[PDB]
Amino acid sequence: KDKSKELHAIKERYLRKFVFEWDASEDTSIDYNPLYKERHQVQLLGRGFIAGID
Amino acid sequence: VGQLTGMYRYKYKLMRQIRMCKDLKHLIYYRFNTGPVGKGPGCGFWAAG
Amino acid sequence: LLTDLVDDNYFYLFDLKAFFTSKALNMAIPGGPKFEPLVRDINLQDEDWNEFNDINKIIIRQPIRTEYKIAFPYLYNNLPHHVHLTWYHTPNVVFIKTEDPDLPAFYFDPLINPISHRHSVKSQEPLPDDDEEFELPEFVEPFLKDTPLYTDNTANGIALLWAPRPFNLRSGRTRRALDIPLVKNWYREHCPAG
Amino acid sequence: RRSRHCPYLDTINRSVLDFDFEKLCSISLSHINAYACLVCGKYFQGRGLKSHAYIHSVQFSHHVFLNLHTLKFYCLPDNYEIIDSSLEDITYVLKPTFTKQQIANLDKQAKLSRAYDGTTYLPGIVGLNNIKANDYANAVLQALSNVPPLRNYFLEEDNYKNIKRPPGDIMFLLVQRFGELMRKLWNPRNFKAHVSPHEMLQAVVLCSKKTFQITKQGDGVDFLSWFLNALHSALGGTKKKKKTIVTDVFQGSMRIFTKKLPHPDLPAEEKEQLLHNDEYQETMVESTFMYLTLDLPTAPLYKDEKEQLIIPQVPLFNILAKFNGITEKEYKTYKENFLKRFQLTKLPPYLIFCIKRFTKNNFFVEKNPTIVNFPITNVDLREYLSEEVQAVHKNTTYDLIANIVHDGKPSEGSYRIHVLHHGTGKWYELQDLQVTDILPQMITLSEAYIQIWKRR
Amino acid sequence: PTGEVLSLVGKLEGTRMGDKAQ
Amino acid sequence: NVMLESRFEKMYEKIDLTLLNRLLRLIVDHNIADYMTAKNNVVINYKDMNHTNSYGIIRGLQFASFIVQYYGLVMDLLVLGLHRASEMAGPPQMPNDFLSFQDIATEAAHPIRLFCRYIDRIHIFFRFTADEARDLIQRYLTEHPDPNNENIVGYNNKKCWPRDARMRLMKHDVNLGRAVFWDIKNRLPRSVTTVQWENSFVSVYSKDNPNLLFNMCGFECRILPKCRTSYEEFTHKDGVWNLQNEVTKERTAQCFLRVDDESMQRFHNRVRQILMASGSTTFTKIVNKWNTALIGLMTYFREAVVNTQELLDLLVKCENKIQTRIKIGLNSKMPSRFPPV
Amino acid sequence: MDFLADLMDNSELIRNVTLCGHLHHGKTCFVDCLIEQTHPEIRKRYDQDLCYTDILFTEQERGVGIKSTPVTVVLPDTKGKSYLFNIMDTPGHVNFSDEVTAGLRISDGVVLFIDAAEGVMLNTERLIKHAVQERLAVTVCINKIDRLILELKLPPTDAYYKLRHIVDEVNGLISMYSTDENLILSPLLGNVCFSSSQYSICFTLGSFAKIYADTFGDINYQEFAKRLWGDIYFNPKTRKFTKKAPTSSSQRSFVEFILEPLYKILAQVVGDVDTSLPRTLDELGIHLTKEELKLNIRPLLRLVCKKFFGEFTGFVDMCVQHIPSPKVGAKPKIEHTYTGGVDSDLGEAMSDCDPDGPLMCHTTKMYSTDDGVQFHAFGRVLSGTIHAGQPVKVLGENYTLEDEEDSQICTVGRLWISVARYHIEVNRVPAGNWVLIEGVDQPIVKTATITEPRGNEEAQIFRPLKFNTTSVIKIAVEPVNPSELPKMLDGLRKVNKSYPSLTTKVEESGEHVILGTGELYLDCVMHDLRKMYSEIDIKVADPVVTFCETVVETSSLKCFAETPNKKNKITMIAEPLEKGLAEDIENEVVQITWNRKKLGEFFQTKYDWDLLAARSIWAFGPDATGPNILVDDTLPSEVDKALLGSVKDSIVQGFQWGTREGPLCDELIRNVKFKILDAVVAQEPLHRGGGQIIPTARRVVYSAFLMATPRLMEPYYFVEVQAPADCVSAVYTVLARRRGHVTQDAPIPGSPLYTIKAFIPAIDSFGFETDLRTHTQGQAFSLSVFHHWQIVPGDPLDKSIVIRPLEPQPAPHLAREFMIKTRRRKGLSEDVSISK
């Protein structure tokens, strides 16, 4: 499946109602590249932590 | 604010704020209800809204 | 409430200039927002099968991503108008924060890879005949010998240098409670995985 | 000594030899050491071992090359100079140099010169090849090339060479390439019957800072004004000279009486006291002009009673009712109106008449199609000069020598030029490539836009 | 239920145009 | 294979009455020809404005069509030439079909292989050998040199098709298209008629271009031969004509149909003028006009609708506009759940 | 101001130095510090840097140095001798290494900036190697000292260990390239300087000893500096410096006297502003106002290090001592640069750097103006003076004494001494200086020599600029509107003048290809083309790399070609070269201009070629040092050697042209040895003309190369990445994804960062930097430089292989595909016509 995603991307490149919610179709963080999907989170030398999260 | 007051009916551009206030909630709640604390009506970080 | 980011290398293609570039070029960074096109140009969006852009002449190894057209906007796409150049690379600020106060401020932390001064080649340098000709006067001492190497605030003072914008200042100007976005840096950074 | 005995003289084909292109290498894009391959007509990097000209010589089997700057021929596969009399014409095509004896004999020429292709043509009357629909520039350049004194000045390089130039002055590029094009136009031994102004158009675009582009077609009057003003600056040292080749040829002196008209919504006593206040009185201001702008009467806007849809016409002297003390023109401005009556002082030897067309109304731009009724043989401007200067100017008779005409609506229109052959007295029109022999009488029945007159 | 005529771009594309005709 | 679709720009407005009278006297009685040409010269009137028509023909005349069908015929003799026109029409005692030749040699003995004039829109299909195409290209470039390769700028293309399915503006192919159009234009005198490049389309099929594009009678047509670029000879798609070779009775080509943009715009404007001129009008009349227009379009195209995905949206939008007009007529406040019954 | 102009007359009081180093190592910030020291009204803002030399809009937005900047300023010495310094602030990015060479040719000294935390990196090694090749004096400055204190918090002993490791690694690198022993480095020798340009710290051992001697007096700062580094310790019991530690934990002299006070002052400033800072400033004699103690930690630290350290006199004394002046440094420069050599009379005159000698400039840079329509040449005057508004003779890279064609007489307009932001107009510029010459731009393309006209006619040109790396990235550039085609060409010319390594070439099909080193280099090139030179819309093709052609087997049959005269026959065979021999030719290890007796001995010794066969070598194939060798092997008794030598030159040109234009895809040919096996030359002199031999020589070269098994060669880049130790696996994954393999992964001593060195395909390196930085979330950074040509897998002549458009082909389908599309890009035929 994901192998055809790369080829499809190459081909595509070259060839009333109130909505409080945001539609899931508006999501941009969708990628076929495994590098851009499972990114390497910053370890911060094992001594730094993302804000908010406990 | 949309559910409490319903002020978007008299100003649709105000929806831009409303959709933002929900968005901030998703930013805060999922940073808040992350550890042993789970989902529930306890978060009180009201600065953003 | 503060992320322990030392430099803005985290915001490589995720900063304000990159988002301006993406908006101007009608594409979008995966984690970035999506915008209505700056100029429609629908007729020019789909150009004809020229001999220049001929796909039969194009070697494909790795597809040109949106990020590539943002990292080097003037090289990878035609008509780069209203586009911004992003900061290339801030040097990796290698800051090693102490984890125990009961430890000297200037300490060879295990995080540093050992220097391991090699003696395989005997380092030879021009050094005069030892302890025979030059003698210091009795009033000559290192500049600050009375002053200790580090106080209790040395580690915390150093860690204050590599701190977010409000906490790396000694003084400043008073702001309004409205004008202080506490969660501004939470969505400015990448969304947490999972 | 293997020179003077080349076997490839028969290889040269003068038909494809077009030197109107830019003198840059077709491969390296280098303007230095430009060499043209006479066999194929394409410029190359230059003569030398391991050079693009050498590569073309050993690839296409083309041996004879001409150096663009040095004007000398070489064989590249062996790289030795070539000296032959029959080649001189080729050099004379690239760099047509006119002697002072020949320069003065161009206005007495009546022979139909022969080209290499057999298309007989008259020197000076040579079609300028349209590049990207900019026939206004071609028409203006042809009209200025028809001017005898300007041509004679520009036919000899040393007239406008060795003049001091400001370090950042690209204006020279406009005047050093105008001479090249003009000597290409008046060369009576052209290989091709036409001349491509493609080389000068680059200098025109560069010097004008992106206006008057090759692709777009600007107004002939505006381009003529800009070109005449730029040539005046391009001549002289770091500081412009009062008397350049454009001032003594085209520039005349005119006097203007500018009277401020009072606002109509004022009391009569207040009106007369304002007139007495010296605020609303005539102020004689002298000035100099490169051309005289002639306003045309407004279109009739209605059919005639008898002959419906009659073309509007006006005699030339009615148009030239300007520039005298008797008549006045109420020039209206969004602030206030003015009464500006003109009075000629010094008539230039060559007088340019720019008829005001393409007037911008309140909503768009429209051309006045009024037909100008002018004679083409003899006029007299003695009635258009003040009495003080009438004695100074003993000559006031001008003959039409060049005429510009605009055909079509201002949105898209063509610029045709009728030029009077000074040597023979015949009139020839040339729309870009096309050249035809229009009768002199049929010249005046056209919507004239720019005219050039000679006082003799 | 709205009664609005919805576009059939991609809708009802499975069937041919010769169906239900005699 | 190069196909040139074009139209005589102002044939109706440029039919000289004296020349038309002579050409009619050629084929019809001089009394009839004089009557027709005199009828074409009358006073055109409108409100307070009136003039005399002495140059063009009046298309409101009942026989005017005949005149056009005659005058255009003359243009064909100017385009095809007498030899090729006689080859196409066949011998006078054995007239040929619409697209046929008496012999294969006559078919292959001229670049122009197909021709149809319609009323004013000429479609011409040339087949060029490499030598003939090269010679035509050189002859065109002799008087029209293009050092800057500017022939690609003004070259019209059928933008309704994707980039791969469109005509590919290769240098040689574009040069051949320009050469063919210039050759055709040179034949017709500029005063009797004219052909304009902007209001014309030239599509060439070669090694570079696999698709043969054109537009005729409101149909945007693209033939993609099965030999070269047909991965699958699918039949399920009902908006695709499956061309066949009458000799081999085998699958050889494949025709894709599409509704032209002009036809869609015409239908949209017709619906607009139905809607806007419906103030004090019955609902039944509005629905009848909408039904008539819709049935006319759908029964004219019948296959080009399915492939024109923009036409489906246009049709449903127009239907929604008509239904909204009816609903507003019933009540000023729009309903929320109006039924389709 | 006037003293600066009057200082140019004395060539001994001038130092021409270039500040070179790895990317983002502090060279620009150091020049900013020097400018602030010299200019009282120029001070950096508290938050933003100064970036005085970063004058381009691209530099102020990308944050990376793009072009070399000249800075001519007068700097005091330790004693106070105001020297004149011409600093060339060169870019640190490897892709702009050529921009360094333009500034490296006209410089007599090299200042290698090394980051203290990072240490020796890729561009640092490349720059020291290259500078040693041009026989330049090398001095080292370790910038960003504070990163050992405020970032790593290393103990002073460990900071000294890191500094010693940094200095000792450069010594082990110069030894690999410099035979001279004087190129050794040591801070006690004055070679090595320490600095932190962010906080305006700049000291050598001599400068800090001078500070000590000013504080206490009666101290020889030279003798004190002689014992302020290494294993020498200080004993206060005898107040004497001993090679043995007086106590158990006696710190070294450098640690105790230099690193300890710096550590303590930085600690007090960054941690104890309110408590102990006034006390320690009174102890150090520094007086800061009440408002100057209100500043934040970083501006306060910079101010207090400005007060304590004062002027940058350590840098000045290092450069003065260890970088020769133009008067004394001219002779090696003339020997390595002037084509006629030092033995020439003009070379001998130029070796003295006489301001009254014949004019001889050497323009290496070309700087655009504000409007971009006029270019100002920039070069070093080597003999005589150049006057404003003076006619001069401007040579070219192709000019020879026999051929005056490449030289055009131009009038020198105004002359400027250029210092970064501003330029001071001058009348004359004596020899040994750097000058912006106006009015000579037209004949100059890349590099030219300016001399006087109507005199000194026997004046050759300086050697053409030699670049560190080959430019292989190729991008096709067209105008959006073809009507604007000339402007692009015009713009192309301008970029060719502005980028030393840029190569603009028009192909057969009409595509204009630009050659660049990397993604950032070409991005900047297109930005310059679009925004300031052409000012028109531009279409850019997808980037592609240049390929070469090689052989792997001997030609199966002897390939013969006969001239159209049907009188000359050449029979040749093709063989691949040995491993490293092509590199030896490229590195100029051996030249065809060598004496023939030892030229054969080289191949007889290192490669065991037969002495007679090695002596039969004709030429270096396509280029004087090109990697293709043409060797004669005709039977002496079957071909007349004297008669064969008559057409030897024509065969040489045919060989060179055929090797420069390959048959496969019209590209270069590498690692091929063509053996001439049979010659039949027409005995008549006029029947063996070059016009017939050269095309025939190219044809036989093509036939032999085709019969020998053809193979395509693609460039491989050498990529080093510095990443946190956690990110090594991510780098491995990215490189494996992009057909790259890791050669080494070594930790950086004295820092947690690991350096991973790998080889990647150049055509697979597009977006590799972006992929690595995005995947690692910015923690990993990569710099890519061309390393070596490698055979791409697959048979390039396999006709059976079918290529699918818009699909990345497998490995065996690469070599074929890389040919065909390239041919389609060149306008060539669909397949290789062997019969041709």
XYZ file of C-alpha atoms in Angstrom, chain G residues 462-663:
202
model
C 48.364 34.202 -13.557
C 47.292 30.584 -13.275
C 43.530 29.989 -13.597
C 41.736 29.528 -10.298
C 41.962 25.960 -8.984
C 38.997 24.809 -6.915
C 38.869 22.345 -4.037
C 35.979 20.263 -5.390
C 34.256 19.525 -8.687
C 30.804 20.953 -9.389
C 28.480 18.133 -10.438
C 24.940 19.336 -9.641
C 23.276 20.458 -12.872
C 20.045 22.432 -13.262
C 18.404 23.446 -16.534
C 17.098 27.017 -16.553
C 14.620 28.509 -19.042
C 12.593 31.723 -19.091
C 8.885 31.511 -18.376
C 8.318 33.896 -21.282
C 10.580 32.935 -24.219
C 10.376 36.563 -25.362
C 12.543 37.359 -22.318
C 15.171 34.774 -23.292
C 18.058 37.278 -23.770
C 17.582 38.780 -20.298
C 18.038 35.369 -18.683
C 21.190 34.966 -20.769
C 22.257 38.413 -19.585
C 21.440 37.370 -16.038
C 23.309 34.128 -16.645
C 26.386 36.120 -17.635
C 26.131 38.080 -14.400
C 25.950 34.996 -12.205
C 28.893 33.564 -14.138
C 30.795 36.696 -13.126
C 29.617 36.505 -9.517
C 30.187 32.816 -8.673
C 33.733 31.486 -9.250
C 32.678 27.831 -9.562
C 29.528 28.470 -11.606
C 29.459 26.945 -15.092
C 26.748 28.036 -17.533
C 26.620 25.948 -20.705
C 24.166 25.885 -23.604
C 23.388 22.356 -24.772
C 22.582 21.005 -28.233
C 18.827 20.959 -27.573
C 18.941 24.579 -26.381
C 18.735 23.957 -22.631
C 20.967 26.233 -20.550
C 22.485 24.180 -17.726
C 24.020 25.702 -14.597
C 26.610 23.711 -12.646
C 26.737 24.036 -8.871
C 28.125 22.227 -5.854
C 25.020 21.685 -3.734
C 21.412 22.521 -3.001
C 22.121 25.716 -1.045
C 24.667 26.936 -3.608
C 22.234 26.542 -6.504
C 19.393 27.992 -4.423
C 21.465 31.134 -3.863
C 22.452 31.185 -7.547
C 18.808 31.111 -8.649
C 17.862 33.718 -6.051
C 20.544 36.036 -7.440
C 19.465 35.299 -11.015
C 15.769 35.938 -10.363
C 15.906 38.876 -7.961
C 18.759 41.179 -8.998
C 20.244 40.157 -12.356
C 17.458 38.955 -14.662
C 14.403 40.323 -12.795
C 12.210 38.003 -14.885
C 10.210 34.854 -14.248
C 12.320 31.704 -14.537
C 11.508 28.000 -14.894
C 13.963 25.590 -13.254
C 14.182 21.898 -14.086
C 14.597 19.199 -11.468
C 18.221 19.065 -10.249
C 20.396 16.346 -11.772
C 24.047 15.388 -11.446
C 26.648 15.107 -14.180
C 27.839 11.655 -15.191
C 31.100 10.292 -16.565
C 31.919 7.264 -18.695
C 34.447 4.499 -18.068
C 35.346 0.999 -19.234
C 35.828 -2.223 -17.282
C 37.195 -4.579 -19.965
C 39.690 -4.404 -22.802
C 38.136 -3.779 -26.211
C 37.336 -7.125 -27.814
C 38.605 -6.211 -31.295
C 41.070 -3.656 -32.625
C 38.960 -0.658 -33.639
C 39.987 1.061 -36.875
C 38.899 4.386 -38.351
C 39.983 5.911 -41.661
C 39.846 9.556 -42.689
C 37.501 10.823 -45.421
C 40.698 11.308 -47.447
C 40.886 7.473 -47.400
C 44.646 7.699 -46.808
C 45.037 7.686 -42.996
C 44.066 4.728 -40.799
C 44.152 4.611 -36.991
C 43.682 1.314 -35.136
C 43.230 1.659 -31.380
C 42.199 -0.370 -28.332
C 40.786 0.709 -24.966
C 41.794 -0.526 -21.511
C 40.735 0.568 -18.015
C 43.238 2.306 -15.773
C 44.637 0.970 -12.515
C 43.246 1.919 -9.118
C 44.399 5.374 -8.049
C 46.249 6.242 -11.265
C 43.433 8.509 -12.464
C 43.403 10.187 -9.049
C 47.178 10.633 -9.304
C 46.725 12.404 -12.641
C 43.917 14.535 -11.194
C 45.922 15.466 -8.086
C 48.725 16.651 -10.436
C 51.037 14.043 -8.861
C 52.416 13.541 -12.380
C 52.218 15.960 -15.307
C 52.707 15.424 -19.023
C 55.195 18.320 -18.835
C 57.544 16.224 -16.684
C 60.892 15.150 -18.082
C 60.269 12.045 -20.155
C 62.984 9.891 -18.561
C 61.454 10.150 -15.073
C 57.874 10.258 -16.385
C 58.308 6.674 -17.552
C 60.091 5.810 -14.309
C 56.986 6.826 -12.345
C 54.859 4.274 -14.195
C 57.680 1.716 -14.018
C 57.936 2.088 -10.225
C 54.447 2.689 -8.816
C 52.678 0.692 -11.550
C 55.450 -1.449 -13.121
C 54.722 -0.297 -16.665
C 57.383 -1.213 -19.202
C 60.007 1.517 -19.500
C 59.707 1.624 -23.291
C 55.910 1.380 -23.059
C 55.730 4.064 -20.361
C 57.983 6.330 -22.439
C 55.450 5.894 -25.269
C 52.877 7.977 -23.366
C 51.613 10.768 -25.631
C 49.337 13.010 -23.527
C 46.903 13.149 -20.544
C 43.867 12.426 -22.778
C 41.271 15.272 -22.659
C 42.751 17.623 -19.989
C 46.400 18.518 -19.181
C 45.728 16.508 -16.005
C 42.568 14.792 -17.169
C 42.101 11.250 -15.857
C 42.411 9.634 -19.323
C 45.794 8.560 -20.701
C 46.667 8.021 -24.370
C 49.520 5.540 -24.858
C 51.233 4.571 -28.104
C 51.851 0.880 -28.736
C 52.497 0.745 -32.492
C 55.052 -1.757 -33.752
C 58.251 0.258 -34.395
C 59.093 -1.769 -37.512
C 55.554 -1.379 -38.911
C 54.912 2.359 -38.366
C 57.478 5.083 -39.035
C 57.930 6.824 -35.685
C 59.143 10.049 -37.308
C 56.169 10.082 -39.686
C 53.761 9.186 -36.872
C 55.058 12.096 -34.795
C 53.996 14.503 -37.546
C 50.309 13.806 -36.839
C 50.943 13.278 -33.114
C 49.479 16.679 -32.213
C 46.335 16.117 -34.295
C 45.795 12.725 -32.658
C 46.271 14.413 -29.273
C 43.543 16.969 -29.987
C 41.249 14.242 -31.314
C 41.845 12.197 -28.165
C 41.207 15.197 -25.913
C 37.976 16.137 -27.689
C 36.702 12.554 -27.751
C 37.424 12.096 -24.054
C 35.743 15.414 -23.255
C 32.604 14.414 -25.207
C 31.694 10.800 -24.494
C 29.692 8.648 -26.907
